[PDB]
């Protein structure tokens, strides 16, 4: 189908940053204090962008 | 073409001609340093290279004694072998 064609066409573009993205996500889960991660989850449950909250 | 064979000139003549060639190469440096107007101390720093080359050629010439004729050397010539007629033991004379 056309969806498979789009998948096999966009595989190589979509996957170039996936390594660094997963690296940053995992390094955050590991190095960051779990209270900060819990606060992030809370704020996202409250419909807020916790990155903007942190910057503010 | 090419061939693997004997040296053209003898060892004595070879060393003599080498010393003469280095003599020329040193004389040219000296004449050029004189043309440039250098003193003795500057001439030394200029042509010490060719001086050392001439001295090494002279050392090579002085170190090599051409062989003396005797019955053993003549028999080795007939046998066409490299032979020292000043050794009673050969390779072991180095240790005795």
């Amino acid at each position: 189908s056309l969806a498979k064609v789009w998948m096999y066409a966009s595989w190589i573009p979509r996957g170039i940053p996936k390594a660094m993205a997963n690296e940053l996500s995992s390094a955050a889960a590991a190095l960051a204090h779990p209270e900060a991660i819990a606060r992030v989850a809370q704020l996202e449950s409250q419909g807020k962008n916790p990155y903007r909250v942190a910057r503010a | 073409s090419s061939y693997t064979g004997a040296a053209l000139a003898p060892k004595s003549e070879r060393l003599r001609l080498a010393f003469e060639e280095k003599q020329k190469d040193h004389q040219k440096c000296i004449e050029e340093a004189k043309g440039k107007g250098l003193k003795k101390d500057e001439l030394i720093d200029a042509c010490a290279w060719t001086h050392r080359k001439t001295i090494l050629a002279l050392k090579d010439w002085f170190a090599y004694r051409p062989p003396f004729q005797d019955r053993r050397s003549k028999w080795a010539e007939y046998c066409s072998i490299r032979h020292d007629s000043g050794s009673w033991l050969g390779w072991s004379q180095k240790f005795f």
Binding site: - | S12, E20, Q23, H26, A48, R52, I55, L58
Partner: protein, 103 residues
Amino acid sequence: VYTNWQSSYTRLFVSKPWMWHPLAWMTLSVGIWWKFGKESLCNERSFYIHTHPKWAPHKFHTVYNWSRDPIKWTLAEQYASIIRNTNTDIEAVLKIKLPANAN
């Protein structure tokens, strides 16, 4: 209680061939250099092989600069120092005419 471990290194060395091994190793390596590597590499007559790209690739971190010739000018400075310390005449060698072993 007496021990050569704490009171005599000589008797300890004598009583242990595994202490002789490094010394023999050292002596053999130095003898190898003396017999093979000394005259073929380190002598002034045999030092330009370090400029060879096949037998001494990048001994100067690059191909050897022949226009510059650092070896020549270094050694020439040193020979000049020798000449000044000895007060030898540069032009005395040119007055020589060697004979030939005629016949």
